[PDB]
Amino acid sequence: MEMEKEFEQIDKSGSWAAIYQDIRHEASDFPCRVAKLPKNKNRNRYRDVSPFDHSRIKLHQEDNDYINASLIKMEEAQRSYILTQGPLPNTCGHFWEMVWEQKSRGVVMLNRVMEKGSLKCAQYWPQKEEKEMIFEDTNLKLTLISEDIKSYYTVRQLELENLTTQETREILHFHYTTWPDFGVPESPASFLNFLFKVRESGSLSPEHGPVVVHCSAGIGRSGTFCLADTCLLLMDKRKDPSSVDIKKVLLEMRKFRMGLIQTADQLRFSYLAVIEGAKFIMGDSSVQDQWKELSHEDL
Ligand SMILES: COC(=O)c1c(O)cccc1OCCCCCNC(=O)[C@H](Cc1ccc([C@@H]2CC(=O)NS2(=O)=O)c(Cl)c1)NS(=O)(=O)c1ccccc1
Ligand SMILES: [Mg+2]
Numbered sequence: 001m002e003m004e005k006e007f008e009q010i011d012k013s014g015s016w017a018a019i020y021q022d023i024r025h026e027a028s029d030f031p032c033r034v035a036k037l038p039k040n041k042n043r044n045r046y047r048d049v050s051p052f053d054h055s056r057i058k059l060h061q062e063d064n065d066y067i068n069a070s071l072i073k074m075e076e077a078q079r080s081y082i083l084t085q086g087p088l089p090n091t092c093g094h095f096w097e098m099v100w101e102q103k104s105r106g107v108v109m110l111n112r113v114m115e116k117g118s119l120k121c122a123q124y125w126p127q128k129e130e131k132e133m134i135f136e137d138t139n140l141k142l143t144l145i146s147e148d149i150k151s152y153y154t155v156r157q158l159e160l161e162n163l164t165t166q167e168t169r170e171i172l173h174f175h176y177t178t179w180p181d182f183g184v185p186e187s188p189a190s191f192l193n194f195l196f197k198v199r200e201s202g203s204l205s206p207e208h209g210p211v212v213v214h215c216s217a218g219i220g221r222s223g224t225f226c227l228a229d230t231c232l233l234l235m236d237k238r239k240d241p242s243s244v245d246i247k248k249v250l251l252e253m254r255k256f257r258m259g260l261i262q263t264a265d266q267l268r269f270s271y272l273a274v275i276e277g278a279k280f281i282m283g284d285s286s287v288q289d290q291w292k293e294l295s296h297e298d299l
Contacts, residue, residue, distance in 0.1 A: 001278065002242040007271045020264035023247055028255045030054055040066045043094070045085045049217045055256045057082055059094055060101050067094045068218070070257035071210060072226060074249075077233040080210040081226050083257050085218040086111060086121025093135030095124055096142060096160060099171060099212055106172040106203025108213045110179050110221035120181070120216035125158060125173060139163045145170075151299035152178040152186070153194050155201075174198045179221050182262055184269040188276040189294035191269075195229060196280075196288065204229075223260030227253060228273040235274070236281045246271060 010016055034040065035050035043066055044050060050068065051057070057069040068091075069084035082102060086109075087095040099107065111120050125142060126133045132143040141163055147156040156173035176194055178186065185191040198204060204211050215221035227250055234249065235241035250267070254260050261267050279287045 001275065003244065003246070003271065003278070004275050007268075007275060010268075010271075016264040016268050019247070020261075020267050023250055023254075023261075023267070026251060027258070028251075029258070030255075032056075032258075034066055035068060037066075039064065043088070043091055044068050045088055046217050049085065049219060049259060051257060057084070057098055057102065059097050061097070067091065067098055069098060069212075070218075072253055072256040074230050074233075074253065077230045077237070078206065079204065079230065079233055081229075082210045082212045083218045083222045083226065083260075084212060084214045086113075086214055086216045087124045089122050092122055092124040092133075093138035093140065096135055096140050097138045100140065100160060100162060100169075102212075103209030104171070104212045105169075105205070105208035106174060106198060106201060106211045108198060108211060108222075108225065109173065109175045110213070110215040110225060111181065112177055115181050115216070121214070125156070134163075150297040152176065152190060152295065152297065153197075155197065172201050172203050174201075174203070176221075179215075181216060182220060182266075184224070184266055185273075187294060188269070188273045189291040190297075191225075191228070191273050192277050192280075193288075193291040193295045193297065195225070195273075195277075196291075199229075217259075219257065219259040220262030220266060223250075223253070223257075223262070224266045224270055224273075227261060227270045228277065231270075231274045232277045232281055235278055241278065241282070244274075246274060 030052040032050035051070040055070045058065040059067050073080045113121050126144040129144050134141050141161040143159045145157040145159050154175045158171045159168050160171050161168040213222045231244050234244045
């Protein structure tokens with residue numbers, strides 16, 4: 001596998017840092033004028049993490065259509081993802097408004113509301129069935145219907161309702177609770193077990209709008225998740241799966257949102273996730289159960 005041969009030589013050379021910084025040096029840069037307007041300062045969690053104007057998600061409101069979110073459209077892979085920062089106390093309504101308007105079916109969360117004593121994202125969904133949420137400024141109601149808590153991730157069924165029309169939709173929430181900030185998953189097994197749970201739910205079907213992926217900034221962990229998923233998509237689609245260049249796929253993704261993949265080890269982890277995942281794509285009908293055992297989700 002050319003992919004694992006390259007992985008092999010990078011490990012031997014000890015050159016992950018240089019490979020990573022090369023991608024950073026070659027990354028696209030586009031303007032983020034809207035995100036930088038004075039009236040949008042309180043809508044961004046980090047001053048140095050903004051969506052490019054050309055790919056930003058526009059809320060349908062006439063007041064202010066701004067939300068720190070980007071549409072990453074991977075053309076050859078044929079999959080679209082919406083990457084956004086962890087909502088802020090004042091942008092939780094906007095966040096659900098975007099989920100509603102874009103017709104998303106699933107939300108992938110890769111961070112925790114509090115990590116190492118610091119708030120990283122607002123509690124934008126109800127933790128208790130009997131305590132539903134109302135986003136006044138948005139005309140939306142959100143209710144927790146049930147949740148399946150595993151050892152390192154949790155899947156939740158939420159009901160989002162447009163109070164105006166009374167239409168309701170089921171939204172699936174895939175929450176990875178043990179992915180350290182600026183770090184990597186415990187193992188490729190645990191990552192892939194989770195990813196294939198999102199795939200198998202139908203949430204990523206082209207019949208729905210783009211799945212919404214976020215972590216705290218929407219670029220480190222979210223970038224890793226999307227990079228691995230897109231490469232696997234491409235390996236299953238090409239006549240020569242060994243042709244997938246992860247570095248080129250990341251650069252293509254970075255055209256839609258800045259800073260995807262935040263450390264050289266998150267890039268190395270992506271190689272491992274893709275290499276391990278290729279086995280299922282190429283046949284292995286036992287790898288999935290192996291990933292399950294290895295990830296000890298029923299701990
Ligand atoms: C590494 O940098 C890049 O890849 C990159 C690029 O190439 C082009 C454009 C942007 C880029 O990143 C932006 C972040 C660069 C890293 C430094 N930035 C940050 O930590 C933060 C932004 C930030 C970035 C990443 C994360 C998290 C890292 C992760 O694994 N997942 S995540 O929730 O996206 C979080 Cl929770 C926060 N901003 S700051 O506190 O106001 C701050 C400003 C200046 C110096 C220090 C801190
Ligand atoms: Mg209860």
